[PDB]
Amino acid sequence: GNNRVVYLKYAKAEDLVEVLKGVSEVMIAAHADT
Amino acid sequence: NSLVLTAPQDIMNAMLEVIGQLDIRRAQVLIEALIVEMAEGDGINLGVQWGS
Numbered sequence: 001g002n003n004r005v006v007y008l009k010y011a012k013a014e015d016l017v018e019v020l021k022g023v024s025e026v027m028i029a030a031h032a033d034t
Numbered sequence: 035n036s037l038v039l040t041a042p043q044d045i046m047n048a049m050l051e052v053i054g055q056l057d058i059r060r061a062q063v064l065i066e067a068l069i070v071e072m073a074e075g076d077g078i079n080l081g082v083q084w085g086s
Contacts, residue, residue: 023040 007034 008016013030020028039049 019038
């Protein structure tokens with residue numbers, strides 16, 4: 001399970017990418033349509 | 035309005051103490067100004083003129 005896709009309920013993925021970049025350092029990407 | 039913190043245990047505890055000390059309630063101030071103005075004035079004019 002080296003890759004996961006997480007569907008967010010209340011947050012915006014583009015917002016969480018910046019926050020999680022520091023914690024991960026690992027790749028983080030956001031799909032806005034879904 | 036959240037902080038995401040990553041650090042070892044000691045730095046973590048110190049940072050949590052600092053956050054707890056800075057995350058407190060502020061008091062409020064009601065400020066009232068009072069402007070007072072008073073003016074008084076008095077004048078008199080009196081004269082006689084002659085012409086032809």
